[PDB]
Design a protein around this motif. Structure first.
Motif, PDB file in Angstrom:
ATOM      1  N   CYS A 198      14.719  26.771  22.907  1.00 20.62           N
ATOM      2  CA  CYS A 198      15.642  27.682  22.258  1.00 20.62           C
ATOM      3  C   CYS A 198      16.459  26.848  21.296  1.00 20.62           C
ATOM      4  CB  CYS A 198      16.559  28.347  23.288  1.00 20.62           C
ATOM      5  SG  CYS A 198      17.851  29.393  22.581  1.00 20.62           S
ATOM      6  N   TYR A 199      16.313  27.126  19.998  1.00 18.97           N
ATOM      7  CA  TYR A 199      17.048  26.375  18.993  1.00 18.97           C
ATOM      8  C   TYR A 199      18.362  27.045  18.557  1.00 18.97           C
ATOM      9  CZ  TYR A 199      14.940  29.755  15.699  1.00 18.97           C
ATOM     10  OH  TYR A 199      14.478  30.906  15.060  1.00 18.97           O
ATOM     11  N   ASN A 200      18.619  28.277  18.998  1.00 23.24           N
ATOM     12  CA  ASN A 200      19.822  28.996  18.598  1.00 23.24           C
ATOM     13  C   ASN A 200      20.376  29.914  19.655  1.00 23.24           C
ATOM     14  OD1 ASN A 200      21.957  29.927  16.697  1.00 23.24           O
ATOM     15  ND2 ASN A 200      20.935  31.884  16.961  1.00 23.24           N
ATOM     16  N   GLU A 201      21.673  29.771  19.922  1.00 22.00           N
ATOM     17  CA  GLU A 201      22.358  30.653  20.848  1.00 22.00           C
ATOM     18  C   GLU A 201      23.576  31.314  20.219  1.00 22.00           C
ATOM     19  OE1 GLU A 201      22.979  28.916  24.785  1.00 22.00           O
ATOM     20  OE2 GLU A 201      20.823  28.838  25.090  1.00 22.00           O
ATOM     21  N   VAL A 202      23.902  30.940  18.977  1.00 21.56           N
ATOM     22  CA  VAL A 202      25.025  31.525  18.243  1.00 21.56           C
ATOM     23  C   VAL A 202      24.963  33.066  18.275  1.00 21.56           C
ATOM     24  CG1 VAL A 202      26.157  31.661  15.962  1.00 21.56           C
ATOM     25  CG2 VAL A 202      25.376  29.447  16.831  1.00 21.56           C
ATOM     26  N   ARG A 203      26.081  33.678  18.665  1.00 23.37           N
ATOM     27  CA  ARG A 203      26.228  35.135  18.784  1.00 23.37           C
ATOM     28  C   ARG A 203      25.230  35.747  19.773  1.00 23.37           C
ATOM     29  NH1 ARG A 203      29.504  37.817  14.728  1.00 23.37           N
ATOM     30  NH2 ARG A 203      30.385  36.260  13.294  1.00 23.37           N
ATOM     31  N   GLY A 204      24.545  34.894  20.532  1.00 23.10           N
ATOM     32  CA  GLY A 204      23.515  35.358  21.448  1.00 23.10           C
ATOM     33  C   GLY A 204      22.317  35.943  20.714  1.00 23.10           C
ATOM     34  N   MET A 205      22.216  35.680  19.402  1.00 26.63           N
ATOM     35  CA  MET A 205      21.049  36.075  18.632  1.00 26.63           C
ATOM     36  C   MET A 205      19.973  35.005  18.728  1.00 26.63           C
ATOM     37  SD  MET A 205      20.031  38.751  17.126  1.00 26.63           S
ATOM     38  CE  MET A 205      21.471  39.663  16.557  1.00 26.63           C
ATOM     39  N   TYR A 206      19.304  34.962  19.871  1.00 27.97           N
ATOM     40  CA  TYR A 206      18.393  33.843  20.213  1.00 27.97           C
ATOM     41  C   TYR A 206      17.242  33.595  19.267  1.00 27.97           C
ATOM     42  CZ  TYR A 206      20.803  34.517  24.651  1.00 27.97           C
ATOM     43  OH  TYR A 206      21.758  34.647  25.613  1.00 27.97           O
ATOM     44  N   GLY A 207      16.939  32.316  19.070  1.00 30.98           N
ATOM     45  CA  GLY A 207      15.770  31.894  18.323  1.00 30.98           C
ATOM     46  C   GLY A 207      15.051  30.819  19.123  1.00 30.98           C
ATOM     47  N   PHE A 208      13.721  30.886  19.143  1.00 33.90           N
ATOM     48  CA  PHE A 208      12.908  29.977  19.963  1.00 33.90           C
ATOM     49  C   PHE A 208      11.761  29.438  19.125  1.00 33.90           C
ATOM     50  CE2 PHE A 208      14.793  31.320  23.994  1.00 33.90           C
ATOM     51  CZ  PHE A 208      15.215  32.633  23.735  1.00 33.90           C
ATOM     52  N   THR A 209      11.260  28.267  19.504  1.00 37.80           N
ATOM     53  CA  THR A 209      10.061  27.738  18.907  1.00 37.80           C
ATOM     54  C   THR A 209       9.136  27.218  20.011  1.00 37.80           C
ATOM     55  OG1 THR A 209      11.250  27.143  16.865  1.00 37.80           O
ATOM     56  CG2 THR A 209       9.207  25.927  17.329  1.00 37.80           C
ATOM     57  N   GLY A 210       7.850  27.452  19.855  1.00 37.95           N
ATOM     58  CA  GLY A 210       6.811  27.016  20.806  1.00 37.95           C
ATOM     59  C   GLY A 210       5.506  27.006  20.048  1.00 37.95           C
ATOM     60  N   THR A 211       4.391  26.931  20.763  1.00 37.76           N
ATOM     61  CA  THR A 211       3.115  26.833  20.119  1.00 37.76           C
ATOM     62  C   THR A 211       2.181  27.933  20.576  1.00 37.76           C
ATOM     63  OG1 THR A 211       2.342  25.173  21.752  1.00 37.76           O
ATOM     64  CG2 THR A 211       3.328  24.328  19.748  1.00 37.76           C
ATOM     65  N   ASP A 268      15.707  42.794  18.484  1.00 39.48           N
ATOM     66  CA  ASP A 268      16.411  42.550  19.744  1.00 39.48           C
ATOM     67  C   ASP A 268      16.227  41.098  20.184  1.00 39.48           C
ATOM     68  OD1 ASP A 268      17.226  42.423  22.462  1.00 39.48           O
ATOM     69  OD2 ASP A 268      16.194  44.290  22.989  1.00 39.48           O
ATOM     70  N   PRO A 269      17.332  40.338  20.270  1.00 38.68           N
ATOM     71  CA  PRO A 269      17.218  38.922  20.670  1.00 38.68           C
ATOM     72  C   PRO A 269      16.612  38.748  22.090  1.00 38.68           C
ATOM     73  CG  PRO A 269      19.497  39.638  20.837  1.00 38.68           C
ATOM     74  CD  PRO A 269      18.740  40.744  20.081  1.00 38.68           C
ATOM     75  N   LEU A 270      16.815  39.721  22.976  1.00 40.25           N
ATOM     76  CA  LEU A 270      16.167  39.645  24.301  1.00 40.25           C
ATOM     77  C   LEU A 270      14.639  39.837  24.205  1.00 40.25           C
ATOM     78  CD1 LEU A 270      18.736  41.440  26.670  1.00 40.25           C
ATOM     79  CD2 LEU A 270      18.696  39.067  25.900  1.00 40.25           C
ATOM     80  N   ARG A 271      14.179  40.582  23.202  1.00 28.79           N
ATOM     81  CA  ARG A 271      12.750  40.692  22.949  1.00 28.79           C
ATOM     82  C   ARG A 271      12.200  39.406  22.297  1.00 28.79           C
ATOM     83  NH1 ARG A 271      11.849  46.639  23.691  1.00 28.79           N
ATOM     84  NH2 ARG A 271      10.026  46.552  22.319  1.00 28.79           N
ATOM     85  N   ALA A 272      13.042  38.674  21.555  1.00 28.35           N
ATOM     86  CA  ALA A 272      12.656  37.361  21.038  1.00 28.35           C
ATOM     87  C   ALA A 272      12.359  36.414  22.207  1.00 28.35           C
ATOM     88  CB  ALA A 272      13.744  36.761  20.144  1.00 28.35           C
ATOM     89  N   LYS A 273      13.230  36.452  23.219  1.00 26.30           N
ATOM     90  CA  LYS A 273      13.074  35.616  24.440  1.00 26.30           C
ATOM     91  C   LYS A 273      11.798  36.022  25.152  1.00 26.30           C
ATOM     92  CE  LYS A 273      15.449  35.278  28.947  1.00 26.30           C
ATOM     93  NZ  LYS A 273      15.721  33.874  29.316  1.00 26.30           N
ATOM     94  N   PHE A 274      11.622  37.329  25.321  1.00 23.10           N
ATOM     95  CA  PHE A 274      10.426  37.822  25.989  1.00 23.10           C
ATOM     96  C   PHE A 274       9.148  37.333  25.281  1.00 23.10           C
ATOM     97  CE2 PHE A 274       7.068  41.004  26.724  1.00 23.10           C
ATOM     98  CZ  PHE A 274       6.974  40.980  28.116  1.00 23.10           C
ATOM     99  N   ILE A 275       9.091  37.473  23.964  1.00 25.87           N
ATOM    100  CA  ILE A 275       7.918  37.112  23.201  1.00 25.87           C
ATOM    101  C   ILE A 275       7.620  35.605  23.353  1.00 25.87           C
ATOM    102  CG2 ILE A 275       6.977  36.838  20.840  1.00 25.87           C
ATOM    103  CD1 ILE A 275       8.814  39.432  20.130  1.00 25.87           C
ATOM    104  N   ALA A 276       8.631  34.787  23.139  1.00 25.17           N
ATOM    105  CA  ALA A 276       8.448  33.334  23.159  1.00 25.17           C
ATOM    106  C   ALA A 276       7.921  32.864  24.550  1.00 25.17           C
ATOM    107  CB  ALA A 276       9.756  32.645  22.826  1.00 25.17           C
ATOM    108  N   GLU A 277       8.582  33.315  25.609  1.00 19.14           N
ATOM    109  CA  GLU A 277       8.249  32.936  26.996  1.00 19.14           C
ATOM    110  C   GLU A 277       6.899  33.452  27.438  1.00 19.14           C
ATOM    111  OE1 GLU A 277      12.741  32.833  28.899  1.00 19.14           O
ATOM    112  OE2 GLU A 277      11.324  34.443  29.387  1.00 19.14           O
ATOM    113  N   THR A 278       6.562  34.650  26.966  1.00 25.31           N
ATOM    114  CA  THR A 278       5.325  35.320  27.368  1.00 25.31           C
ATOM    115  C   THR A 278       4.105  34.834  26.593  1.00 25.31           C
ATOM    116  OG1 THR A 278       6.571  37.317  27.998  1.00 25.31           O
ATOM    117  CG2 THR A 278       4.194  37.642  27.635  1.00 25.31           C
ATOM    118  N   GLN A 306      12.751  34.758  16.158  1.00 25.85           N
ATOM    119  CA  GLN A 306      14.205  34.855  15.860  1.00 25.85           C
ATOM    120  C   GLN A 306      14.681  36.300  15.895  1.00 25.85           C
ATOM    121  OE1 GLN A 306      16.733  32.456  15.246  1.00 25.85           O
ATOM    122  NE2 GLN A 306      17.792  34.431  15.455  1.00 25.85           N
ATOM    123  N   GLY A 307      15.646  36.657  16.756  1.00 26.42           N
ATOM    124  CA  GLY A 307      16.178  38.019  16.746  1.00 26.42           C
ATOM    125  C   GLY A 307      16.937  38.246  15.429  1.00 26.42           C
ATOM    126  N   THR A 308      16.982  39.491  14.939  1.00 27.93           N
ATOM    127  CA  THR A 308      17.644  39.755  13.650  1.00 27.93           C
ATOM    128  C   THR A 308      18.868  40.656  13.763  1.00 27.93           C
ATOM    129  OG1 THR A 308      16.358  41.724  13.153  1.00 27.93           O
ATOM    130  CG2 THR A 308      15.449  39.574  12.506  1.00 27.93           C
TER     131      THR A 308
END
Ligand code: HPA
Ligand code: HPA
Ligand code: HPA
Ligand code: HPA
Ligand code: HPA
Ligand code: HPA
Ligand SMILES: [Cl-]
Ligand SMILES: [Cl-]
Ligand SMILES: [Cl-]
Ligand SMILES: [Cl-]
Ligand SMILES: [Cl-]
Ligand SMILES: [Cl-]
Ligand SMILES: [Cl-]
Ligand SMILES: [Cl-]
Ligand SMILES: [Cl-]
Ligand SMILES: [Cl-]
Ligand SMILES: [Cl-]
Ligand SMILES: [Cl-]
Ligand SMILES: [Cl-]
Ligand SMILES: [Cl-]
Ligand SMILES: [Cl-]
Ligand SMILES: [Cl-]
Ligand SMILES: [Cl-]
Ligand SMILES: [Cl-]
Lengths: 231, 231, 231, 231, 231, 231
Positions: B37-50, B20-30, B59-61
């Protein structure tokens, strides 16, 4: 059972499963105390003795899914065997799989139809018992025995004109043998624990043979891991 | 790549893969610092942080073999991703699989035709990277997170009139999800490391649902294992 | 339903089904009056509004048989949806399939195992609802929109090392996408009407891409056909 | 060709294809002017004559994929036939398929292995030529001939102990015959146009037979559609 | 029966089964006394007469598994036929199969799906009735008719782009025809006796045709063996 | 060869192939003069001696397609063996197959994937060498040994939860064993002659066991047929 001439209690809870019945004899006589041969049917020998005062059995399986399936089914169903550890060899199909490496199979691919017979359109992926695998892994690591954990290919045809081992190697598969899929599938179907531990007898694709010395050494390491994991 | 709008270096060597791409957002932010956020194509979000000063991507799949196959192929081939960790849920298909158990998949069965397309008469058994699995296992054990290691079923049909999960459960299979076979097969074919870590969202056969609290708890344990295994 | 957060009556009898949930948003906002978003679960957006005073819904499906199968099953079974119209793109696999052509799929071939799972030795040929297809055909012809009627290929692997699209093209197949077989099979199994309408995003075999302008134009034609066929 | 004794130019661009060679004779003599029999090999008669001053041929095919495949391949490859129209009957497998309905097949399912022989893991969905289908449809509609457009099942076994027609009917399949998959696949593979037009000879599941009068009537409607679509 | 217009007792216990109904007429008129035609349906002629005062029938089957399956099923089930002897031709696929050789098929391979439809993962190997085969063998040997006993290939596609006859020949297969698997499987399933006797019409791989004289000669030998074996 | 420790010329042109290596010893010692054991590898014994002054070898094969395939391939390829005669037992699956009957297999069905591995969509029907079969048949008939000629089933799983032997019996199949398909396919692929001769050890479906006396008697008849056919 039909193929094993033992009486109740003659076979231990833990059975090692070499393919070659003469290697079963070698293992039992070389590693165990107070050995009795409980089976001579078809000359597929089975023995029981003790290792550090714990009963361990050693049962030859023959070659191929159908032959090991017979012994595994009878061990489980007639003798209530709990832990089933194949100790055998395989032909390595990758360069990174070294001749000294002891292989612990997490799973196995196969060209046997045994699972499509049961599942049809499902690809059934057999699975090693993780508790057995981890103990074996720990045992190798403790002594510094080189160990590689991954998958193998269970082949029906030792001489296969249509072999896909090239492609299997590219997908990460480590080596080819003729028993694992059966052992892992049958043990799991009956709630028992199984693991296959394998030495490398050659590299199938380069034709390069392992020396007799190399084989003696790896064989002893395999048996030590099999035993140590278990005590 | 075709489906991911990132620039080179924007994606880390290690990527977590929720469905779930919304769970990708949750994980990255939390869980991560300094998130982009490096990807918004199709709303399949991908994020990078440390995480502890180490770059981690998330990355949502999407759902299903075909959807994860797209993202995994592009991550590996265009972004040179090395470690791919699905963090998701599954429906448990055995009573002994408890709602609090975190599952580490050694392998997966499937009704996807993706491997018969490649291998024909061969049953290809995908295989987790053992190094990733063992680190995750150690991480759970260290904190006392209940963890179960075994196999899962990768299903094409969430609603399947011809489901064989009854039989799969009897062969030891722990639960059903829709991604693992693809992740493990593709990563292995390209020499990358993969692992699937799964929580239990319900018991498919009893219809019994896990509570929202239970799910929040297991989710955090899964993420902690995913991260900790990795630092 | 499990994956769609709508209340009863919130989804129309007729649903358009783009693969990309952001294209669902675009379609609803651009073409329909009085739009409400009835679903945000997994960010797979669904909207309902009116076109010439008739309720029309637009639901993203994601990519691949397994993902559309989820949405189609829930739309039919929980929301009693009657007409299901995929509006998407495909890669053309023949030279005679022109970049401006709007494709109406009569049927689709597939490498998904979803029908062999149900039928075994039977090749199930999915079938568009002829009433929907003919209305769409009439609508295109009425305005002079170039339209081609034939079959497509529903692929599981966007990146397929074992692709047979060369041979499929020689048998007359027009293009490759990832949804149609599922939509047509599921709708038919439940007595609902389905149709897939497709634009051409490129020629897979020549690698030749369609321009952004060409795509904007064909997209509008597709939507116009979808709508007009329906009012 | 091997099985057809005609000389070049003796067969028309358009050939009607009944299964029964005696029905080929009936059609030619009853509907066409200036008829010549161009083939007597195996008593599988073929005739050519004119309908409104346009040459039309009528060629028996025999029963089953393998038999029609012979005639279709030879017609296309040796006689450069462009339009191939099966005119035959089928057993209806749904109640909503009425005895007076003339069926136009958009596609066909099959238990023949002919396409798995060519495509392996692909389900190939054959496809009628839409131009032929639409002309036939228009022709029926123009006169008020009841017409149903959908799919059929091409069976290898007229007497099949393992028949799946129950399930096929639930997926929307209209009826069962023994030729269509071959005709549609072969014509398409060679860039020719094909269509199957079918009457209903009974309801397979209720055993209910159509009367001789009903059959005479539907047969004439089928032939009228076949011809009219074509002039 | 549906496809055979005979009355009870009109068909003998022993039926010869040529593929070509005109060859059925030829055989009956040329070899038998007091001939009646009991079937004209579809022009697939069937005749009964006497050979040395014993009733013998001769029934055309058409080409292909599906067509012979119809006639064989009806002969067995409606007419209680006991002995079923295909008398036909095949294309030789080995050099050692000579143009004068009369072939007695012990078994047949096939690309028909008819047995996988019934048996799934089982390869069903059809089997000639040994009593019929041995009588035919003895009959040839007695007169010095060259005779070869082995297996044949039952093909669905006379024109097959994916033919495996090269490989089949290397495995010992003698020739290719389109009926035997069906005859042997159906007869056996109903407890009747079957045998296929075949002449060689050409060598498929060298394209080399047998002369009209050679064919007339072998045909007479085949019929003589068929009859003699039977009286 | 890899699995057989013999020197050139030590193995005869004709080899008998019991499954059980201890039965190989029994046969050689009991029936042949001047016996030498040429193989002890894996305890799969092979012997050579003379019968009426003609060299005959006897080689154990083990159980299952994969195990016999090893021995047969090595015998043919390394030792230029010409005639290969399995002498073994089977479980009868029909009532009409009597406990005293000696079975000569014309062909065998199988659930082994070995031929689908080679042929894909083809059902390969293995075939006994007719010259060997007829000699064995004549030998039995000459002495009045009850003999039945037909087909058998080559099984991969001695314990098979998904057994189709019920259906196989209805199609005429006589009994179930674990070797024949491999022997017949491999011998034929290399231009050698093979035959399987089988006694009945029980009736699988009634569980009814043959007595030790019955087995001793049939075993001697089998060996006598094997030998006599050969001198
Ligand atoms: O090639 C082989 N096939 C099966 N098992 C093996 N063990 C070593 N080599 C092989
Ligand atoms: O039944 C299911 N199918 C696939 N994935 C799932 N995840 C939870 N339940 C399921
Ligand atoms: O190659 C492809 N595969 C699947 N779907 C597609 N849509 C455009 N190209 C493709
Ligand atoms: O049951 C049948 N099978 C095949 N074709 C048919 N045509 C009418 N009935 C049938
Ligand atoms: O190639 C062929 N295919 C099928 N049957 C035949 N009979 C002669 N040649 C052939
Ligand atoms: O059931 C069996 N399976 C395989 N071989 C056998 N031989 C006797 N019984 C059997
Ligand atoms: Cl103990
Ligand atoms: Cl071994
Ligand atoms: Cl192999
Ligand atoms: Cl870093
Ligand atoms: Cl998930
Ligand atoms: Cl499922
Ligand atoms: Cl409305
Ligand atoms: Cl799309
Ligand atoms: Cl593809
Ligand atoms: Cl004309
Ligand atoms: Cl017809
Ligand atoms: Cl059917
Ligand atoms: Cl008589
Ligand atoms: Cl013929
Ligand atoms: Cl062929
Ligand atoms: Cl000799
Ligand atoms: Cl045996
Ligand atoms: Cl079985």
């Amino acid at each position: 059972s039909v193929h094993i001439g033992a009486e109740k209690g003659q076979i231990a809870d833990t059975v090692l499963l070499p393919g070659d019945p003469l290697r079963a004899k070698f293992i039992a006589e070389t590693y165990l105390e107070n050995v009795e041969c409980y089976n001579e049917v078809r000359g597929m020998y089975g023995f029981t003795g003790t290792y550090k005062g714990k009963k361990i059995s050693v049962q030859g399986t023959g070659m191929g899914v159908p032959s090991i399936s017979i012994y595994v089914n009878e061990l489980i169903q007639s003798y209530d065997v709990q832990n089933l550890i194949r100790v055998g060899s395989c032909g390595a199909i990758r360069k990174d799989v070294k001749v000294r490496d002891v292989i612990l199979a997490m799973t196995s691919s196969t060209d046997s139809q045994m699972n499509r017979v049961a599942f049809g359109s499902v690809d059934f992926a057999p699975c090693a018992d993780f508790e057995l695998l981890k103990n074996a892994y720990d045992a190798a690591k403790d002594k510094g025995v080189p160990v590689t954990v991954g998958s193998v290919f269970t082949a029906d045809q030792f001489y296969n004109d249509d072999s896909q081992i090239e492609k299997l190697a590219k997908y990460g598969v480590l080596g080819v043998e003729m028993e694992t899929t059966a052992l892992y599938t049958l043990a799991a179907k009956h709630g028992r624990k199984a693991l296959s531990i394998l030495t490398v007898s050659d590299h199938v694709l380069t034709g390069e043979e392992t020396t007799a010395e190399e084989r003696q050494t790896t064989f002893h390491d395999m048996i030590d891991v099999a035993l140590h994991s278990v005590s």
